[model samples]
Structures are given as structure tokens and as C-alpha cells.
Target: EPQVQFKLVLVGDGGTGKTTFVKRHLTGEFEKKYVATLGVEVHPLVFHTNRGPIKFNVWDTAGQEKFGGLRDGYYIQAQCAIIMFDVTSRVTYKNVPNWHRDLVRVCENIPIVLCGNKVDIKDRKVKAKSIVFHRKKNLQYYDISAKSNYNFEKPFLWLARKLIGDPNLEF
Candidate 1:
């Protein structure tokens, strides 16, 4: 069994469900309460793929602007990155450009996945239509509920397929 390692970082402002996304995907637990990430949280998960056993070192960082200094350091050597935003938070959606720009500056030519989370929020102020306008080339985007598992793993599957250089692979 070959061991493959992939580093994935989740970047987004506070209250955008970054931690929730990681917890639900990695541990199969959906947390209803909100807790501000103190500094940074890192979770490693191993999955058995047809090619090999791939390990994902997923990093979730604090969203406070002051911590921006430590953010670029995390992007180093990242194979894939997910820049997320909240469906109900306009400010979070507005920061997508900055997030993309930062990622591009640090990880040029690397794969990036842009995600809009919290689709379960009934009264969403930031509509999907408003976000589509900010989409860019080479960045895959998805609007889904991480809690409900709607298209939750699509971006990761796409990244895996791309990494293995097999377009026909089911993601």
C-alpha cells in the first residue's frame, strides 16, 4: 500500500463554518454550536483510493485579520486549497477576491476550490447569483450545505482526480 500525502487548507473569515466543514467531513459529526477557532486547527484523514492510501492534512485557520500574518505560511506547499464563504454573510462573500488573490500570490499553479457554505440557512442575505459574478478561471466553485452533505466532497474529489491525472476517475 503506497502512502500519498495531500495538504489542504481551509481559508475563510470567522463564522463562515470552516471548522464545521472539517469536522463533518473528517469525523462524521455535525456540530450545531458556534465556536470561534482560537488559533488554527489541523485535522488529518486517511482515505483508501484505487490508486493508493491518500492522507489529507487539512488545516483550518483562525479568521481574525490579525492572524493574516501567519496565513501565508500555511499556504506553503499546499496541493489543494478551499476558500470558503458563508451564504448568509455578505462580508464573507465580498472577501472572496482577496482570498483568491492571496492564494494565487503564494501558491501559483496550484489547484483551488471555492466553496459557499451554509446553504441550509433559510434567510440568506448573500444570494448565489451575487457570488457567481466573482468566479475565476482555474478555481472550481460550489454552493452547498456542508451540514446536509450537499456536494460537500465534490471539490476534494475533483482535486484527487486531477492529482492522479485520470479525468475518467469518479469523483
Candidate 2:
């Protein structure tokens, strides 16, 4: 058996549910009260995969403008990333470009999965327009509900397979 480790970063706009997503996945519980992230919160998740035990050093970054100064350094050394956005807020979805640009500027050619969260909500502001952009950029997209734990594993599993260079691998 072999163990592999990689760094993964999660980035998006403020109040877009980046932290909530990570917390839900890690602890199998969701926190209702909104608490802003000050800098970066690191969580290590180990998954038992077909190939081996894969460890992800997941970094949940602050999306607030006040903490913008800390993001670039967090992006450094990241092997992959999840660019998250709230489906209910078009503003968060629109800011995906800036987040992607910053991630690419620091990490360069890293595997990125575009995540549209809050699918459980009835009112969605982000629609087909963003799909075209994602397709044009050749990015993998997933609609997830962090609160309901819906399709939350898809992005990480996709990223794990990508990181290991085994597209057919299952987690």
C-alpha cells in the first residue's frame, strides 16, 4: 500500500459557502451560524482510494476583502483547487474569473474543479451563461449542496483522480 499527499485550496467570494462546504465534508456536520474566516483554515482529509490512501491538505481561504492579502501565499504550492460559487448569488459566480486568475497566477496549470454550491436553494442566479465559460475553459463543474451533503464527494474524487493521473480510478 502507498500513501500520497497533495495540497488543495478552496477559494471564492465572501459568504459563498467555501468554509461551510469544507466543514461539512470534514466533520459530517454543518454549522448554521455564519462566521467569517479571518485568514486560512487548514483541514487534512484522508481518503481510502483504490490506489492507496490519499491525503489532501485542504486549505479553506478567506474570501473577504480584508483577508485578500493572505490568499496569494496560500495558493502557492497548491496541487489542485476548488473554485466555489454560490448559485443563488450572481455576484459570487461573476467573481470566479478573478479567483481563477489569482490561483493560476500563483499555482500555474494546477487541476481546478469549478463548484457551484447552494443547489438546495430554490432561487438561483447563476445559470447557463457560466456553463459556457466553464466549458470553454475545459473545466469540470459540479453542482453541490453543502448543507444537504449533495454531490459533495464528486469534486474531491475528481480532483484525486486527476492528481494521481488516473481518470478511471474510483474513490
Candidate 3:
């Protein structure tokens, strides 16, 4: 295994397009059907970098205990994270703080990407200019659409750069 491995934690409430974003990297297909996730799902996301292969063990979780909360226990040992939220749903955007806080509590000082998903929707609610969560939190931000594959590589590219400490790295 020549590729360097890192654990990437992805967290958000239900219907925030968290699973959809992860699936894009998996199958490159947009799943219209909403499927209930299990407690957690881990998959290796590989990227071809200039230096070598970069492997991110993506940890995608589901609501547990009927509480509509993510399994925070899976957050341990995370090297980086993507705090995902739906731009179409203001409530999910509002919940970004909670996800960030939970992640920080477990994996402090790690690189985090504040991702706004579903930007391809016609009736987009969260505009690009109004977003202030990432700036205030000192986290990187990206607008992505799992359906359109827009900026799909950005989140990982940014994270890969940070994790490898090379800003000009191409994946």
C-alpha cells in the first residue's frame, strides 16, 4: 500500500445531501431516491496526486437512536472533515455550527471544508455571498452539486493539499 491514508469525516443531518456527495465519488451517479443510512459507512476514496496516491477513508454516518443526530463516536481519529449542508434548506445550513463543534471536539486542529451542497437547484436559498460560517470559523468553503458534478473535485483537492502540506499539489 504505497498510498498515504487519512480518515475523512463527513457530517450533516438527514436530507442535507451528505450521502449524495459521497456517492458521487463512488459511482458518479446521482441517486434520486432517498435511502436511509446505517449507523456509519466507511469507504476508501482514492486520488492520484503528483507525489503519490492519496487515500481518504471517508466516514459517512446516519442518524442514530431515532434522535436525528449523527454518530459522533465515529469522528475519532479523523484527519480532516467536510461539514456538509444543503443550500436549498436553510435549517441544514443553520445546523452547520453543531456539526463543526462536534467535529472539533473530537478532532481538534484538523482541516475542515464547509461544503454547501445542491447548488444546482433552481430555487437555491443559500446564496454564495451570504455564507459566513466558513470565514468566521476559519475553515475553507466550497459550493458543490452532487448532481451536476460541479466543483466535485474541489473539496477533496483542498483537503489533499492541506493534509499533504503542499498548496500546489494536483490530484
Candidate 4:
């Protein structure tokens, strides 16, 4: 079978659990805490469907742009992306619109996923009904706990289904 690959940009504020999520696929198990990323770390994650192997070269971009274009620098030419925010931080959710605008501005409407991370936390600040960013932009949304591995692959699989134009994409 022929293999396919594409760039997957992961973006969010510092300490928003972007790296923690990437570490799940990196270590191939349930994950825990991790240090912040410096520039950008590209991790290749592969998911096997019944037809063949699909690879997403996930670009875990640094939360802080140490230099100009170092942030959006990774955003270009990506086939898909994930705009993650901390559910425990209402402030993080406030940053969502800005991120979404910046994303579509550069990425040009590529399949993007909106992920609310740290959903396992008590008294999650961003309530379910309040998450309208995904609906407004027609992006797939997932409440993922990178620590608990909850819905870890939902965003990824949704991208696969949309990108491949297959509604029944599966493992």
C-alpha cells in the first residue's frame, strides 16, 4: 500500500499541554508532565487503518516565539492543525479566537481541530456550552486530557476522515 504523510501543526499558549499531548504518541503510552518546548519539535505519529498506514508529521511548535516567524514559521504548508487551549484556564479560552484567526489567516482553511485540553481538571473553567469557537469556524472539537489519554485520537482521526474524504475512517 502507498503511504501518505502531511504536516500537522500544534499550537497553543505556553504550558497549554501541547508537548504533553505529543509525548503520548512519542512514547506510545499514557503520559505525564513535560518541559516546555524551545523552538519546535516535529514528532512523526503513525496510525494504521485497515487500508494502510497514515502518518502525521506533527509539528509541536513552541508556545513562545523566540524569534520572528519562528511561530507562524511552522504554520505554513501544513495540511492540518490543532488549536489547543487549557480548559482550566478561562484566560486560555479567551486566547482561542486570536489563535483561530491567526491560524486560518496563514493556513488557509486547512482542516483544523479545536482541542480543549486539561478537561480532567475539577471546575473546568470553560463550560461545554461556552465552547463555540469550533462551531463558529466549522472545526472538529475534542475534549482531550493528554494525561488521562481521553479522546487522544479523536482530533487526529477526525482530520484523517476529513482529509481522506472517508466518513468511516478507523484503526
Give a tens-digit lDDT track for model 3, residues 58-118. Answer: 9888743363344888998999998888899888888889889988999989999998889
lDDT string, candidate 2, 46-129, tens digits: 888788788888898889989767678898889999999899998888788888888899998988999999999998888756
Shift in Å, residue 127, candidate 2? 2.1
Give the clashing pairs for model 2: none
Task: Tell me, by lDDT, which candidate is best.
Answer: 2
- Measured against the true structure, the TM-scores of the candidates, in listed sequence, are 0.89, 0.94, 0.94, 0.92
Rank all candidate structures by their TM-score, best first, as comma-separated numbers. 2, 3, 4, 1
In candidate 2, residue 6 scores what lDDT? 89
Worst 10 residues of 2 by lDDT: 128-137
Q: Distance from true position, residue 40, model 3, in Å? A: 0.7
- lDDT-based ranking: 2, 3, 4, 1
Residues 3-98, candidate 1, lDDT per residue (tens digit)? 677888789888899888888878899999988776678898666766666677888987777755577788888888888899888999888888
**What is candidate 1's local distance difference test score?**
0.80
Q: Which regions of candidate 4 are displaced past 4 Å?
A: 29-31, 65-69
RMSD of every candidate to native, in Å, equals 1.9, 1.5, 1.6, 1.8
The CA lDDT of each predicted structure is 0.80, 0.87, 0.86, 0.85
Task: Give the lowest summed-lDDT range of ten residues in model 4.
Answer: 64-73
